[PDB]
């Protein structure tokens, strides 16, 4: 015998977990996040883009559109902590967004249906965008920080 | 904020300016000091001359080339005041000291650049009126600085060229200012006025 066998062995059975008291409750967004608000993307592929906020999804994500015809940003999901809410608003009444949900963006080239509903959503948005002058040019440009810009004193 | 900050040493108190620059170098900002011969030190000229002679007599007894080195130039006097406020015997201190340049007068590389001032170290803003002060240029000459007249002659030549440049800049600014005022009273000007610009 190279090593003396232990007289006691621990149990191989795995104990069950105690009952957890942590009930999931819906997220409350900050007051600046209202549908139709122009958002500035702070990270990701489309960082610095100015998009339009549409709907709040069930997985605590925000549904946004560029629109794709203006600045090339399609219907996507973003995180509320990675955007900046501006003071400008776009009317959303007349835009159908109840078809888009968490399962719509399942991961599993571009599909055909994604192209069609992009144009349907954007057409209503573009009509409302033309109401105010220089707003279309505003959405096409990208946000950036200049020399001397202090974010703690900037108003959006 | 600038990649290189050029400080005009005229009218600055030596000790207060040295503290400001030493912290800037340690924080990673390159500093250039010009016109070191126009620096000021509080106290009468005789007091500061006596202080330097006290510094002069300190030397290694068995070999004078080993002892403290007594640099007479105004730029090196300010450098001595600055090296004492930096841990110059460490690699961090050595790297900080390589971000600094001090010159007598304004050499050609920096005579066409912008010079700033440090209000914390300005003699006119710190010393009580009536208090006596000394100028570093004359103090250096009394302790053996040889190039006071050469710097004075070169600085006179620089000012003649600098004044001619300013005259043309003034004329162009008057032309630009008139056009901006003429461009006012327009719709674009009114919209800019409503937004603060």
């Amino acid at each position: 015998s190279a090593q003396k066998a232990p007289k006691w062995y621990p149990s191989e059975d795995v104990a069950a977990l105690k009952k957890t008291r942590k009930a999931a409750r819906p997220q409350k967004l900050r007051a600046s996040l209202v549908p139709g608000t122009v958002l500035i993307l702070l990270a990701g592929r489309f960082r610095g883009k100015r998009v339009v906020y549409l709907k709040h999804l069930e997985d605590n994500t925000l549904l946004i559109s560029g629109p794709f015809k203006v600045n090339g940003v399609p219907l996507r999901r973003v995180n509320a902590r990675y955007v900046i809410a501006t003071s400008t608003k776009v009317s959303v009444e007349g835009v159908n967004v109840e078809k888009f949900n968490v399962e719509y963006f399942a991961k599993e080239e571009i599909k055909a249906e994604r192209v069609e509903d992009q144009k349907v959503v954007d057409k209503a948005l573009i009509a409302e965008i033309k109401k105010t002058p220089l707003l279309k040019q505003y959405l096409s440009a990208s946000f950036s920080l200049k020399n001397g810009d202090k974010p703690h004193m900037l108003k959006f | 904020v600038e990649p290189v900050v050029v400080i005009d040493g005229k009218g600055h108190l030596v000790g207060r300016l040295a503290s400001v620059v030493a912290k800037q170098l340690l924080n990673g900002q390159k500093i250039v000091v010009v016109r070191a011969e126009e620096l000021n030190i509080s106290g009468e000229f005789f007091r500061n001359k006596l202080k330097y002679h006290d510094f002069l007599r300190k030397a290694t007894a068995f070999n004078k080339t080993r002892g403290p080195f007594h640099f007479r130039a105004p730029s090196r006097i300010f450098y001595k005041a600055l090296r004492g406020m930096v841990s110059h015997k460490t690699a961090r201190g050595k790297a900080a000291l390589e971000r600094l340049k001090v010159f007598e007068g304004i050499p050609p590389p920096y005579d066409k650049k912008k010079r700033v001032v440090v209000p914390q170290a300005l003699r006119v803003l710190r010393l009580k009126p009536g208090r006596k002060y000394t100028t570093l240029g004359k103090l250096s000459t009394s302790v053996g600085w040889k190039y006071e007249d050469v710097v004075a002659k070169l600085e006179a030549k620089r000012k003649v060229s600098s004044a001619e440049y300013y005259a043309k800049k003034r004329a162009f600014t008057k032309k630009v200012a008139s056009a901006n005022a003429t461009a006012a009273e327009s719709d674009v000007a009114k919209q800019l006025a409503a937004l603060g610009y």
Partner: protein, 126 residues
């Protein structure tokens, strides 16, 4: 393969080396407690080496556990390997250093059939 365990924490991974074992060749690195009257190590002055003490003891739930989560048990033949038949999730077999090359082949084959983990299966491989 082992039972789930809490994250293993090592309070002091660095070896405790005897003072001045890097200064003289005759002083080995095996830990010895300084007992001199003036010793800076014994008096615990700032900037000196630290000394072993009971405060560094590891959590009893993760003590003696290898990073894979098993406890090492040295085996020398087939008979003592089979003592781990019902304890495959807590113990892993290690073959003794003096086991011949041909005997290691028999042990490894039996361990694979029983599902017993072996920590040194590449020893004496032709």
């Amino acid at each position: 393969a082992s039972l789930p365990h809490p994250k293993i924490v090592k309070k002091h991974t660095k070896k405790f080396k005897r003072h001045h074992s890097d200064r003289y060749h005759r002083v080995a690195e095996n830990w010895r407690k300084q007992k001199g009257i003036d010793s800076v190590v014994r008096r615990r002055f700032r900037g000196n080496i630290s000394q072993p003490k009971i405060g560094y003891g590891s959590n009893k739930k993760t003590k003696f556990l290898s990073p894979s989560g098993h406890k090492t048990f040295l085996v020398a033949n087939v008979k003592d390997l089979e003592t781990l038949t019902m304890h495959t999730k807590t113990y892993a077999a290690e073959i003794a250093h003096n086991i011949s090359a041909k005997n290691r082949v028999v042990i490894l084959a039996r361990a694979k059939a029983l599902g017993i983990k072996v920590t040194n299966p590449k020893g004496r491989l032709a």
